[PDB]
């Protein structure tokens, strides 16, 4: 379901642009795919063998960027789709990168710390000559954290000398960047502000309904409340609360710290966990799950702006229903692009050898998001479509233009 | 059918040797697999994209060796099986190599000469950092000839300087080896001589029935007739002849040069093309097709020695029927190993910078084949099996021993 | 004629500085010269062979910088002179570069696009190990444009990995720099402003006569008119106009867009194309051809400041006549140095991995030009000469000082 | 005069072979040419600058081979001609090499030992990345000896690690080869024996007239006398002797050791130094100077076989006069090829890491010379020409065949 959205959108964007068939066929085939065998001895002494993989889609615009995934179940079609999506997303945000995706087919909940370190180091030894500073830059993903990036950096340094810029997401004392934890919420807030200012409104004095308190949800809620807006509904995996005149987010954060839930809050009454999506509001921000909007919920919603901060929260039929209603949906390919931009900033800081302060990071992030939205709006106006197809058209056009400009060996 | 024989034989050989399960699992997983995209402009100007692949099984004993195939239809299971078979075959012949297999999914009958050269050069540019003199040595295969090796050598030299030993099968004036065309027939004759001398007989004064006149068939027939034997039946794709007192091979070769068939020969009468497999003879040598022996033909044959110079000419049920009859079958994993041995000799000559004469090549080939047969006979006597399982046991034992000796990262 | 000016100026500058003869002899001999053969198949199939060349003068101060020229007629003396001139010019502008010059002896008007791409790629393959990021950075020249730099970048990346900083002048979406088109006019305006402010005057309220509308001429005219000056005479290859109270440049630019000439303009009357060089004016700026000032015109001119924005517009006898008259001539070695400075900025941006905005580029350009003029004025005051010999003395002194500081192998 | 012979012979050989014009044009242009500046401080402290050069003609058959020359006067045309001649000569002898030639424009009679070492080391540092084991192998020439090769080896080893095979002609204890001093005389004797055995005669019982006692002359005379022939006339720079029944060479060698001349010998009477070229003899061997045969001497000679052991001893008109007379001339491109063959053997021994004995060297040299003569005779019979054009045709054909086989980038 998540792999068909990307390729359907690509076909539609290619139809809009009138691309040549040969160029589209060339944009289907990935630049390279690799499978290697990783065999380690356990703590007992016995051997265990896994299979590691790496897919690299395009490099027409610069180095390749992508995450390393530690999950037992893998599928080549899903991995190819994810690599292609990373390519388009990087093209949209206008950072000089490509797309990639890799991982190991193992379950990290069964291995101790030492075995996990051995597995990471062996994987790095096997793929050391296919990554690099200007070739391919791994990043952490699910099943992976900053410690794994530290181990990868250590092994690659053993091979090619001290290269701090080969990975992103490192700890702070190994060359990490400030402002990583709040990047996605900052990006969502900046995108929402730009979208609102397009129509002449502003964040100050509007109504927001936020679904979830992951990092994205809590940071977006805190930033919105600081800006001057009022939030009237909050969800979670366990519980949901409402307040018609605004919820004190600063109090709610410390309430969740101790209680661990949203039950028995002070400034708000509990509500059913299936109705907040239909509340009266100005902006609706889903941040937890994808596909939560479908045919049944499509007719009932009465929001005026939807910001897709999650991964694929909207189905196509619901999208057409909402288009006929008259609401505006910001695509997820652009809304949650704060993380990749901050990773690019960290890569730049490591290349330069000099670290920035947090203010510089935030200003650069704001500038990049605003410029991206202006470009997407112009491209949407040129071809007379909606925002999603504007984004995909812009990305595909950039990549195709670079590919044809670079050359075809005569 | 051809991919199940190799893995069934591996399972049986592992059962005989009592190998650990972990080591067998490690011997299943290939060392590396690669897919790349090769896009070229045609003579008109339009673009065409193909997908090239390369599988590298093991390198526990030295560099990797394998062929490049230009065939429209590909299958990962078949390619993996072929790479594994090359690994075992190299282990049997006792040359310091591993196993690999690669190719391009295109039909060379539709491309002109210039387009074919462009395709080869682009493929080499894409896989240049994964092959080498002591890493992986490509060889020609079906759809490929010596000119392709010349082009590969040229491009790799552009990248890494003059490296004549990166490929085998080059033309004679680019660093090729003498005695390449007659290698397989020489090997078959040497193996047959060793097998006969095992039981006390000799080639001089026996009866041979040879199926086919490819290079292998004609060279084996000529060498056998020179040695002192008599051949009494000859086949082809079109026609088959017989002579109870021996056929003049030296005359038959020039007869086929002009007529182009075996019809209306002087010293021999025509025969049905489905009965020669049941002729009275001492040695039967199939050289054209595989699977030609099955249940129907198994009971009728009355030969005393079968030499499998082709690829998989015997089915398992036929093999057991023949074992109960009491005949001896030389496995094809060992009989047709002349080509790889001569390729190894060419690699050695290019490493040394000094070319050998033909006599030295022939003496070395004879020594290697005799030593291989003595080793296979000893290993067959140790475990009380037949010749085929002796060969496979010897190969698997060598590879496993090297792998465990090399180390497991503690 | 253009090759004797540079070496005569070098001899005079060496005489002024009192340089050792050994050091001068060492500064004559170029660091390296290379000739290679470039053979390609045409679209028909037939072969064509050309000869490519590259001269690298000095590298005492950093990497080497120079242009690639596609012209049928070549001469080693001219190429050596151009490389030496680039060395001195880079030394004057105070950017850490050296000097070089290369090209191919072919006529690009006879080759199609595909053949031209093949020629560029083959040339790059032949000289790939003699250029680099910190070794030698090619730039476009006449017969060459940004597409050729894209092809060179592609081939060099195939060899040494992604290296965007190996060439300058790339397209914008491949890593180009903003503000390239207006660099030379900006530089001329900044130099003129500094020269005027030396004597206490200012651009606001003076009279300018500009010869030509190439990029340099139109940009200088537009910037001068914006600053507050008035232009009273304009030339072209076809036509010339005059207006005693100032010409609306903003209107003239759009007039030339449609009409394609300067005839029948609104705010100005046509004039003879051989008299504007003798108009009453404060500043005279030739921007089209060289050598336009000679003995006949030397006595007639009545300007107070001459800014040589073209290549060698003044002859020596005319220079001495003008010196006796009492006018001031800004040398061309310094006036048109905007292009190399902006190319250096692009190289820096590609090294850092982060692109600048246009304002930063313009501020840095202004700072560099002002500092260069102050240095040249100080050096001119030290030795009691004019501006041209001050420039050449400064450049030669910098290069000699670096060479002697670096060492002579004891 | 010496540069026109080679190119005239090339034109004639191309006319005989019917070569394409494009291929001939491609065979004119050298692969690469390099000029560098070599500046050293003298023993006093003052600086001296020279210009070093290196020309590399072709590498279609393997590494490049050529000599380093220390002579004050240089000429690009002469150097190009010498490189081309080395290419053809290597092609004739059938060793896998190309052609090159380099040197320094200095007079070694004015520099002390330390300054000469400094010059050699600086030259090596400047051209270190353009030579190598499989790229280009320098050799000593006039103005150069084995000590210079030792210094070059030392510097190149400092750069790229211990590489004993980068130069040939090293001292014996640094990896030199046995049998170097007598290589050319051995080669001349072997060639003469093959030429005589072509017509049915033999060396035993013939008459020889040898002009000169350089290394070639003395070694050829000693070997011929040992074989069973009789020498009846000997020349030198100072003096000439004759004996109708044979001269004791073993006594003459020790006579020259003490006296230092050929005057007052025991077994032979003095003769005029301008008549021995017209003596009655079977074989005439000039070994000292070139061009000694011309129109005046052409009609007077009465020999039956001429072996050109020197460099260009025969003029074209004299050649046609001698052809009409009916004598046979062995070309110098083949007669004196012993040195390059022994240098190739030394290169092979250094590549292998194991030194040969003298007997193996002599046997290999004999085999190579005999095979070369048989090939030249066959090629001469095919096209119905004389021996010289047979040699040049064979060389050009080999080089062109390799070039077209290697490829043209489609
Ligand atoms: Ca692609
Ligand atoms: Ca394995
Ligand atoms: Ca110099
Ligand atoms: Ca050439």
Swiss-Prot record, chains A, B, C, D:
Chief place where the protein resides: mitochondrion
InterPro entries referenced in this protein's UniProt entry, alphabetically: Aminoacid_DH-like_N_sf, Glu/Leu/Phe/Val/Trp_DH, Glu/Leu/Phe/Val/Trp_DH_C, Glu/Leu/Phe/Val/Trp_DH_dimer, Glu/Leu/Phe/Val_DH_AS, Glu_DH, NAD(P)-bd_dom_sf, NAD_bind_Glu_DH
EC number: 1.4.1.3
Keyword Oxidoreductase among record annotations: yes
Catalyzed reactions: L-glutamate + NAD(+) + H2O = 2-oxoglutarate + NH4(+) + NADH + H(+); L-glutamate + NADP(+) + H2O = 2-oxoglutarate + NH4(+) + NADPH + H(+)
Subcellular location: Mitochondrion
Listed name of the protein: Glutamate dehydrogenase 2
């Amino acid at each position: 379901n998540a792999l068909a959205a990307t390729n359907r959108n690509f076909r539609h964007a290619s139809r809009i642009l009138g691309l040549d068939s040969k160029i589209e066929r060339s944009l289907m085939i990935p630049f390279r795919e690799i499978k290697v065998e990783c065999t380690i001895p356990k703590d007992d002494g016995t051997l265990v063998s896994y299979i590691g993989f790496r897919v690299q889609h395009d490099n027409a615009r610069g180095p390749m960027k992508g995450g390393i995934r530690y999950h037992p179940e893998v599928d080549p079609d899903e991995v190819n789709a994810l690599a292609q999506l990373m390519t388009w997303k990087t093209a949209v945000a206008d950072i000089p990168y490509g797309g990639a995706k890799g991982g190991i087919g193992c379950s990290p909940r069964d291995l101790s710390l030492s075995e996990l370190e051995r597995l990471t180091r062996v994987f790095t030894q096997k793929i050391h000559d296919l990554i690099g500073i200007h070739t391919d830059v791994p990043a952490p993903d699910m099943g992976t954290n900053a410690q794994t990036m530290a181990w990868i950096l250590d092994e690659y340094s053993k091979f090619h000398g001290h290269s701090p810029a080969v990975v992103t997401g490192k700890p702070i004392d190994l060359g990490g960047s400030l402002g990583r934890e709040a990047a996605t919420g900052r990006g969502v807030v900046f995108a929402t502000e730009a979208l609102l200012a397009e129509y002449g409104k502003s964040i100050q004095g509007l109504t927001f309904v936020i679904q979830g308190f992951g990092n994205v949800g809590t940071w977006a809620a805190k930033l919105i409340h600081e800006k001057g807006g009022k939030v009237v509904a909050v969800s979670d995996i366990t519980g949901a609360i409402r307040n018609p005149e605004g919820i004190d987010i600063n109090a709610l954060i410390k309430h969740k710290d101790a209680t661990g839930s949203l039950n028995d809050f002070n400034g708000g009454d509990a509500m059913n966990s299936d109705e907040l999506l239909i509340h009266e509001c100005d902006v609706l921000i889903p941040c937890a799950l994808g596909g939560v909007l479908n045919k049944e919920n499509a007719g009932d919603v009465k929001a005026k702006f939807i910001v897709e901060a999650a991964n694929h929260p909207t189905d196509p039929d619901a999208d057409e229903i909402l288009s006929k209603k008259g609401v505006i949906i910001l695509p997820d390919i652009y809304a949650n692009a704060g993380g990749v931009t901050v990773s690019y900033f960290e890569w730049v800081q490591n290349i330069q050898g000099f670290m920035w302060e947090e203010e510089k990071v935030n200003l650069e992030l704001q500038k990049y998001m605003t410029r991206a939205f202006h470009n997407i709006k112009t491209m949407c106006h040129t071809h007379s479509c909606n925002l999603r197809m504007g984004a995909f058209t812009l990305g595909v056009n950039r990549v195709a233009r670079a590919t044809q400009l670079r050359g075809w060996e005569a």
